[model samples]
Structure formats: C-alpha cells, structure tokens
Target: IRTAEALAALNAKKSEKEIWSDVVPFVRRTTDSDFDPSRMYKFITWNVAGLRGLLKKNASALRAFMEAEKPDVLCLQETKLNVDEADANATLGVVDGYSFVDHPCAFKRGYSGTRTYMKNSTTVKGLHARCTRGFALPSELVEGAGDEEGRVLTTFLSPDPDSSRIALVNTYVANSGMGLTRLPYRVQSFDPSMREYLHRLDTWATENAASSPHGFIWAGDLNVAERDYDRYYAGTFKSMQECSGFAPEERMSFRETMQRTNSVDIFRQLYPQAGPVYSFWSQRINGRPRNLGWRLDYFVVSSRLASYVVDCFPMPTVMGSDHCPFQMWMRHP
Candidate 1:
C-alpha cells in the first residue's frame, strides 16, 4: 500500500537508499499482523440438511454460533437450495464477514448441494483464490455430469511458504437411494471419479498454483458408514439384507480411496478407541436423543497435513439440524 509519489520515485531499479527509505517504511506503515506466526487454522464441515431450513429452526442462535466459532474455512453439505443465486443470497446473505461459493442442485430442487465459506480478510483473499464446483479440471466437470446433483464444492488455498497449496474439497457424496438402485453409480462412477479427482488436483496445484503438489483436506457427508462402531444398532444393521451407505460396494470403494498414498480417515484415525462418535442422525426415528447415529461425515486429509491436525471432534449438542457439525483445528506452516 504505497503512496503514489513514493511508488513512482522508486520506479527504476531500486538503489539501496531508495529501497531502505521507501519500501521498508511502506511495509511498516501499512501493517498489522495477519496472525501468521504459529498460525493454526480452524475448519468446520457440517451437513446442515438444508441451509434455509436450519436457519428457520433458530436463525439468530446459528448466527451467534458462527460468530463465536469463526472457522478459517467452513464447508457445508446438503444445502438443498434453489438454483437461483439471488434466492440463495437472500437466504444467508453475508454471515458476518464471510462470503460463500456454492453449487446448488439445478435438476432437483431441495435435494443436495455444497457451500464453502471463507472470511473476507485481506490475507485470506490473496491466499485462497481459485474455486471449482465439482471437478478441479475443466474436462472432468462434464465427464460424468458430476455437477448435476450439486454434490461437491472445492476451493484452493494459495501456496504456503514451501509453494504447497491445500485443496479443500467439500462434498455431499451420492446416496445409494431407497432400493440400492444408485449403488452401481455411487461405487462405480462417482467414487472412482473422486479417487481420480484427487490425483487431478495434485497435478493442478503443481502446474497452476506452485511447484509442489497440493495437500487434500477432503470433508463433508461421505454418505457411508465404514464399520460396526461407525453406526449404532450394529448387529441389526449388518444382519439386514443391506443398507445403502453401509453396503459392501460402498465400503470397499471408500476404503480403497482412503488407502491412497498418504490419505487418512482423519477422525477415525485420531479417535480409534472412542465409542459412538457420529455426525448424522435420522430425525424421523428419534435418533439424536438416543445417539443412535452413523458417522457419515468426515475429514480425510493427506498424511502430511494430518500431522498438523490438532483435533477433529463432533459437536452434537450445538445443533440446528439432525446432523451436527464437525470442527477441525490444524496448526499452520
């Protein structure tokens, strides 16, 4: 933020005195810290079920919760809003200083979608610039019509000190449907595409953002429960013919993806011995009251980023929906 005259005077190759007098003072004068030293970033991912519906339950209280929790990057799944930008904007217009980039369903209204919010700080504006709806590259955006369900939203965090960026993919994965009819599509089409999408992002970062490959912070409603402990009523759940999210196809595909080079199912990895920790509960069956829920939501990150992960825990108490939020804290570069 240099004064016009000061900037113009140093237009040529800067002499030592000109550099010392102009740029040094300019840096000091227009300064406040971005809070970077030992900077720890807080991220929150939630399946709000429906954004407008969640607000209708208690609007001001939700606002206050956000005011206090102030995540650096916020990801929301199943927003279920109308396609009209104006309509969505009117619904949650500027909560504090955070603005959102979303992909809402156009084919099916009130069905599924994603929204990622970033605070409009000077530092954040520069640091987290590029965003995409479902796929990172232009080709994949149309490869399988991934954007139709509006299930994924991605934002790139500009390169860190080592020229490494973090690609945060916020998604509401395809559900297997009422009769497992969509299971084939979910496992065969969507999951593999997603697996490949991660590879795409790394190359994208290397070429577009920096020399180093990108790290992943994959979050949202994955729509599947991996194991017995991940869901309540384990015996019956497994004994039955099969459930959508817990079916063998879903489990196998999810596991295969997480088995990637350095990927980790972060929450489960951190709290391996803990019991009945979940995010989504069925509202119709009185699931929340009894904690009979499934850990469908997640924070899967590359192992390199996993070291910085401080904590990723569920907040079942502070809720406006059957699906509670998951907060993740990570130390920065």
Candidate 2:
C-alpha cells in the first residue's frame, strides 16, 4: 500500500512537517493551475445495494451508465460478495479502462462492503485500510472472517499528474437495520460504532491531505442518516420528535464538526435550492412512494478544495442501482 510506505518514510526519523514539506510541492504543482475548474474530472458516489444483486437484475443498464456517464472515479457501497473469489469489476462486467479495489465486511457474507472502480486514464496508485476502533460493527483485522465489509478502499488518482490530483476514500458504514431485533431503534440514535468509524475516516483524510497537499474526498453510502431541519416539524411529521431519533440538532452538530475539522459536504454546498434530495430508497416500501428516504450517501470534500467545485447533484434519473448516483465536477488546471 502506498500509505504504508509513505507513513514508514515519515516515521524514519522524519517529522510529519518534514514529510509534508517534501510532498506538498508536488501536490501544489498539480492542483494549482489556470486550467478551467469547470472541466475538472467527474466523480460519482453510489450505493448499488447488493453489487451482485444489481448485476443479476440490471447488468445492461449498469454497463450503459458506465459507458455513457464515464465518471473518472466511481465509489460503491453494499457490494455483496464472498471473499475467496470476489472480483468487483468482473462481477459487473466493467469495461476495458477500469479497475476496482474491493473491501468486504468481516462477518456476514453479503452484508456491508465497498468498492472503487477507476478509469484507465486514472490510477489506483495506492490503498490503505482503516478499521473503526470501539466499533464491533465490522472487524478490520479478522482474517478470513469477511473483514471486507467495513469496506473502505482508499486510492490516489492523478488524471493530470501536474495539473490535477485527488484521493478517493470509498466506504460503507454499518447499516441501521439488523435483523428483526430493534431495527427502528438502531436507525434512530447515532450508533457510536458508526460515529467512531466516520471520525477515523475524517482524521485519515486530514492527515493524508496535509501530508501530500492533495484534496481527499470521503464518498460512499455512509448508511447513517442526517437530520434535516425543514422536515422536523412539518405538517404532522413527528420524525424529529421521535425519541432518540436523528434530530436536526444532531445534524447541525455533525455539520459543525465537519466544517470546523476541515471537511465540507459537497452536495449541500452546491444544491442549496434543492431542499431535499435522497440518494437511497427502500425496495420494501414500494420505492418509498411517500419519498421517505434519507439523505445519507455523500461526496464530502475538504474545505480547501471547495473553490474548485463547479457542480454537484444527485443523478436520480439514471437508475440501475437502489441508490442514485451523485456527481461532483471541478476545474482542472
């Protein structure tokens, strides 16, 4: 993994500052340029529910979307697959120029996982695995136990080596539902295990971006939902009043924490007018006819890169997966 070597080098009598001093220049050369930010590479985040399931049902639509949309970096969540003979791209018949990095869950065979598919013009250059501490949701070190599910695959892509750069962190958080045992309660309160996982993710991205001067994005089906103020007390909607539920206050707290800590929610920043947008819907509820889905999946980027953002929105019309795909476009020098 590139991260291992990079960290080892930093630990070899070199301070973090020293490590960054040598690396930031290269990042700046690539990220800082006059190239139109509007034409920057496109990135998409989607939760295909069960990767294998989707492949079985809509293989053609899936392939067509990839060929037409052509996102440079595609991150997936809930990629159901057994470890022994799992292949991300092959399972879905990904085309010639793309390759995938797989990370599956540790326990359940088809539960919780993540995958990253990158175009040939891009590069996977490096990868790092992070397990959530205090989170028994998915054990990252349990060998042969399906640790692939906490599912996070980090990759650095340099489409324009000297003019544009990015690091993509593909992840899947513990689902809010767990069998017939108190599924409602689990989906309400913020799970401590999931919270710890997200925090670790933020920390990792900050450390890497600080060290290399590259913008890092945490994108995927985060599973955990955010509370929206607008929906809190609207027209007999008692969702916000529900005990231990995800409340607007909690959502604000999360947003504040992200902003103060360096990360920014790309979608909210770009589509303020789009009051409510959902990327994932339930198949159980008949396509959520009431539109009761939550805004969970995100393409969150560091605040430093906010200026480069040109457009960001959910592509709800293109449906091959349970979760709609969201895109982020930036200006490349």
Candidate 3:
C-alpha cells in the first residue's frame, strides 16, 4: 500500500487489535536493528498529583519503590513545587545518588510543574547529563498563553565513548476541564507549541545522526486519550465522549503532534490490545476500585529510537496519586 493509504487505514475508526496489527509490522520494519542487551536502561514517569502531598503521605514507600525499581532515570509531573520548596523537601534531599532538576510554575505556587531525576551511575556508565527547562519556544508561540506554569523539562544523556545523545522531555500538559473551558487554549496554543518544539528536536536528531546517534524520548501526563482503547469503560461513562480528555479536538491535536515528530506511543505500540490498561483513574464513583480510568500518561519516542524499546507497561498497583507510574526499558546500542 502507498504510505498515504496505509496511514489512512491506521487512522480510520477501527478495533484496537486491527489498528495495532498494522502498526506493529510497520514499526518493526522502520526500527529494525541489531540488539545489544548489556546497554539496556529503564526509565519511569509518573504524575504525583502534588509532590508535597506525596512526600507527606508516602515518602517512605515511594523511596522504597524507587530502590526496588532501580530506574536509570525518573520523570515526574504535577510536582506542584517551587524551587525553595523542592529543595527543602526531605524526600528530594535524601534520594541518594540521583541528581535532580526542577521546573516549577513561575506565576503561582503549587501549580503545574515537572522534575527529572538521573542516577549518578549514569556517569559511571559513560553517560553525561544536561537538563534544561522548557523548550525555549518563540515568544509568539506562547504569547498570552500563560505558559509559565513550568510545563516542560528536558534532560539530555550523552554517551562519552559513543557520540550518541538521548533527549528526554518530561511535560505536564494543560488539562481541559470537564466543561472544556480550557479547550481553546490547549488546542490552539499549547499543542502547536509543543509540536513545534518536538519537530525542532526531530530535525536536529536527523541532521546530526551521522555524527551522533540522537534519540528522542518524551514522557509525562499528556492529558489526552489518543484512541478509544486507551480508556477503561470509555463508552459507559456519561459525557465521556464530550469530556475534555476524550474530545475530538484534543485527540486530533495529539495525533498531529505525533505525526509531525515521527513519534509513537510506546505502550500502545507494544501492547496494542491490552484491555483496561490505564494510568489515571477518576476519584468519582469509587473509580479506582472499579478501574474506571483513562490512559492519559505516556512514553512517546521518535521512530528512530523505537527499536530500542524493549518493554513499556504501567505500574497500577503503586498508590500515592490518582495516576500510576508507567515504565519503559530501552537498549542504548
């Protein structure tokens, strides 16, 4: 089939199994590469509703979980912490060997924010880290958008011996509330700006591929369900179709962004037909117990790095926030 025809079919309304059947083969073909097991790394991302609250309630358990998971890198959303607050937090101070970076809302206290943690062992393993705040979007792109909520944080890991750099972007996208009050802002300004920033990264990675094997990985609570399969009991929830996260405009924006950057949702790409796989559960109607939720969190990576994706799954049993942590494993070379 022609590229356009294949894409049309993939995008058409269809069962999860059918869509992913087409997707899997296409991804495998595009990202084919020899495997190197020794260079594997694990990364995890979660939205801890509020960092302060998490520390207050589950600090010990959270630390224990990290010790057990032993992720090479950790990304968090909805940190809702200021610089001073983050530094002062006891949990953040005692995370042992993981260096941390925080990007908190500039306009308000305890609002949208992001944090990235990288293990010191990364350096011992020949990787150097460089974390940056926001994507430096053009002023016009974020003009009048009130984007100072510290929504994006990026960490670049470069292998000293290999000339390869992996860029990891952690974000907390603006949520459009139930009434869709923030829909216009999200679809019009935030989504486009994010796409532009990712496209720039894609272009850079491609242009510099020969000199350095650049890979792009974006993870966080993106706040939109790109497909019907991503939510549990989707149709049964009243006004679910009209809800901000499942609205047509939001999904379309997310689809366009992924297309523009040649990125794929890693979890869906791996477990396309995995039923009831969700990250965020609503608090209403005892949603958690009933497993009534939406998969709003994700790990999206450039197609160039898709081959390295060994595993992608959610850790639903961990319970500090409404959203569960999701993890991804990748091989470096």
Candidate 4:
C-alpha cells in the first residue's frame, strides 16, 4: 500500500513553516492561465444493482452511456458479478483503455460487489493502486464473524512519485434487512468502523504530506440518507422513517461520521434547500414515472479536497439500475 511505505516516509523532517512555504501555489497564485481545463477529472459513482443483469438487458446501452459520459473514474456498487475477471470484462460494456479493479463476491453467485474502472489517456494521467477487499469492521476483530459480503474496495492512488494522492473508498453498504433486522448492526458496529477506516486513510494522507495535501473520497450507495429532503417526504414520512435507508438512527450515524471524519456531503452542501433531487428510485409502484426516489448515492469527500470539488450532480436521465449516477468534477494538478 502507498500508505505503508512511500508516503509514510517522504522528505518531511522539515518544520511546518518550510512545508507551508513550499506548498503548491496553484490555488492561491490565482491566474486564469494557472488552471488548465484538461486538469479537471469527471468522476462518477453509481449503484448498478446487478452488473450481470444489466449487461444481459442493456449491454449496448451501457456502452453508449459510457461513450457519451466518458467518466474519468467510474465507481460501481452492487455489481453482483459471479464471473471471473476476463469473463466479466468481456461483457462489461465499457469502452477500451479502462483498468478494471473489481471485487466480486463470487461464493454466493448472487451478492454485493464493486468495481472501479480507471483509464489512462492523452489528457488524463493514470493512477497506480492496489485495493483492499472485504474490509473487516471492529466487531470482526474481537467478536468475529463480520459481514464479508464484498462490501468495500479501499484503493489508495499514487498518481505521482513526489507525493501521495487520493484514496477511493468504493462501497456497497449492507442494506437494513427486511423488518429492519440489520439496523442495529449497521448503525452500531459498521458505521463507526467505516468512519475510523476513512479517518485512518486521511491520517495517512495528512501526516507525511503536510497541510493535508492529499484527499480521500468515499463514494457509492451508502444505503442511508442523512436529510429529509433527500427523499420523497411529502406524504411518506411515516414510511420513510420505518424504511431501511431513511431510519432516524442510521441518518444520525451518517451525520456524526461525516463530522468525525472531516468530510462533507458534496451534493447536500451544494443544494441545501432543494427537494426531490434523488438518485435511487424503487422499481415497484411506478417509482420512476412518479419521480419518487431517494438520494442514497453520494460523494463524501475529505475537507482537504473539498475546494477542488467544483460541481456535483446526479444523472437521472441515464438508467440501468435502481439508482442513478452522481457526477463530480474535481480539479487535479
């Protein structure tokens, strides 16, 4: 891991003053020519309910969508892919040049999974990474038997040699089961551990690289909404409260985690007072037709990189899953 050796030991015995004086002056230098338009990367995160199913049903459409959007970094959740690497890519439907970092929960043959498809191009530089699979929560360490549903893929990106870069934490958070049986597990054990993991990465990025030059992004279907307006709350507060994703405890947990990790909900921060701007819509009861949905998908980025986050919004017009894709334009040097 880049966090283990390379970044852990940079040329950082100098004092804070030296680091400050040597900091990158791109943002503060403030000139139109200083910022390059090609340095902006379009990152997209989506919960693609089932990759295999979507390929079977909408393979060509998915390819065309990628051709049009051409996301620089694509994070997908709930992949439910049971095939091997080559087989999976054979039908992945995306255009060429993407380096697929996939974590497939194969034993079940039908389950939670994730994939981060990255690309190297003339305009965009490629990233080097090795993702950690099946992140074990705190409970699993002591009490044992943690949920190993292929939930997370923690990849630390080292785009350059002089310094470290962002960590992409792709996840498909476990849904609160039927009857809300899994709510306690999620809010109590999983959420805190997840925050701690993010904090660990942030610490790794900030300690050696002074002034928090590095950033981390936790993106995917978090399976919980932190605000009321994120969902259809007009006549559905009761159901929403009892529902799995919008339960009060889960919502509070997410809020606390964001604060504790020094992270921000990019979408909510951008549109604080808006309503019904959602990413996920249920398939039953004419959900999409009625425009009833929940904004379960997110791009919670570390505060160190929040300034670089120029725009974040949902692409509901494109659809292959229960959830839509959230696009974010982040500037890179």
Q: How does residue 325 of candidate 1 score in lDDT?
A: 89
Taking the tens digit of each residue's C-alpha lDDT, what string does model 2 give over 110-209?
A: 7777767776553443222222212322232122232334466665444333223455667665443433133333334433333454555555444533
Cα TM-score per model: 0.80, 0.67, 0.82, 0.80
Maximum-lDDT candidate: 3
Candidate number achieving the greatest TM-score relative to the actual structure = 3
Q: Write the per-residue lDDT of candidate 4 for residues 129-246, one digit (tens) a residue.
A: 5456655322100122223666777666666634757777888887877777898788777887788888887876667455344878889899987765566654344555667887
Tell me the lDDT of candidate 1: 0.71
Model 3 segments more than 4 A misplaced: 1-37, 83-86, 89-93, 123-125, 137-147, 209-213, 234-238
Per-residue CA lDDT of model 1 for 1-333, tens digit only, reads: 324542343342423333223211101111113323246677889888888788787778556876877777888888887777656444573587776777888789887977888867722574644567767553311123347889878877763533767778898999988787898899779999888887677566555654123577889999898754566654333342166776666776788888853588888667764556778888878898888888898999876677777677887777787788887876665
Candidate 3, residue 197: how far the Cα is off, in Å: 0.7
State how far residue 232 of model 3 sits from its true place (Å). Answer: 2.5
Model 4 misses residue 318 by how many Å? Answer: 0.3
Ranking by lDDT: 3, 1, 4, 2
Please report how far candidate 4 places residue 173 from its true position, in Å. Answer: 0.9
Displacement of the residue 82 alpha carbon in candidate 4, Å:
2.3
Query: Per-prediction count of colliding residue pairs?
Result: 0, 11, 0, 0
Q: Across residues 34-68, which tens digit of lDDT does each residue of candidate 3 receive? A: 32335778889999999878888865855787687
Q: What's model 2's TM-score?
A: 0.67
| Poorest stretch of ten by lDDT in candidate 3 | 137-146
